Design a protein around this ligand. Structure first.
Ligand SMILES: C[As](C)(=O)[O-]
Lengths: 147, 148
């Protein structure tokens, strides 16, 4: 029953409670093309990795099957916007390349969409092989982000 | 003579950036909190935003003394787009050098689609300001330019 732990905020806890219906869902997306193909696994307040490292979102590199923690849910921040919700997981694995040695962080932009409870999970910004944004941004739709 | 410089073509960010040109001449401002801990945020798209902080794309002005904090610089811009939204980021702001650590501040502006206006409704969502210690600056605004 390990859920999100808010970095620190109760206004914030209300937002997490609103996202409860998504806790059991799993979200995944594969990017790139052989050889350098990667796969992202995202979950709301639940483990997304296979190394029980408390990861809220992971990047799996398809050459070695290596898992990189983008962010952990025990360091969660969440904000309500005009037609969206921004979920953030901090404390991921350190970049130890050109991006510096800072720990990765995961940002998921949940747009309001009354037609679906949750869908269309897709990466927008990443630090993946050739793509060097030194920033991880994902998007998805949810009727939960409405109002 | 200088405009937004991207971090790192990409001529998608480029093109995506050209889309915001009609906002260059506009000045955005939002005031928060109450006396004597009142603050003002001034934001501009690819243009100087502060009173005395050269290169700043968005500045936080403490109204009690006019002390200016650079949240982000437009010479370290990043810009992404999604379904009915565009995210503009200014990096290289002043370091927190506090409980947040010593990373540089960054300004994240989420622009949502609104066919009723070119640009409007700019205000803070997250901040490191007074008792509000999010160690993160997120702003939002409406713009027809973000309609996909
Ligand atoms: C988690 As019926 C944009 O790679 O879905």
């Amino acid at each position: 029953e390990k859920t999100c732990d808010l970095v620190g905020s109760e206004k914030e806890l209300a937002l997490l409670k609103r996202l409860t219906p998504l806790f059991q869902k799993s979200f995944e997306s594969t990017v790139g093309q052989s050889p350098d193909m990667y796969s992202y696994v995202f979950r709301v307040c639940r483990e997304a990795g296979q190394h029980s490292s408390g990861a809220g979102l992971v990047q799996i590199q398809k050459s070695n099957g290596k898992e990189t923690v983008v962010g952990r849910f025990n360091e969660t921040q969440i904000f309500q916007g005009s037609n969206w919700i921004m979920l953030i997981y901090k404390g991921g694995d350190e970049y130890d390349n050109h991006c510096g040695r800072e720990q990765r962080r995961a940002v998921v932009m949940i747009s309001c969409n009354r037609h679906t409870l949750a869908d269309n999970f897709n990466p927008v910004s990443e630090e993946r092989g050739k793509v060097q944004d030194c920033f991880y941004l994902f998007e998805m739709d949810s009727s939960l982000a409405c109002s």
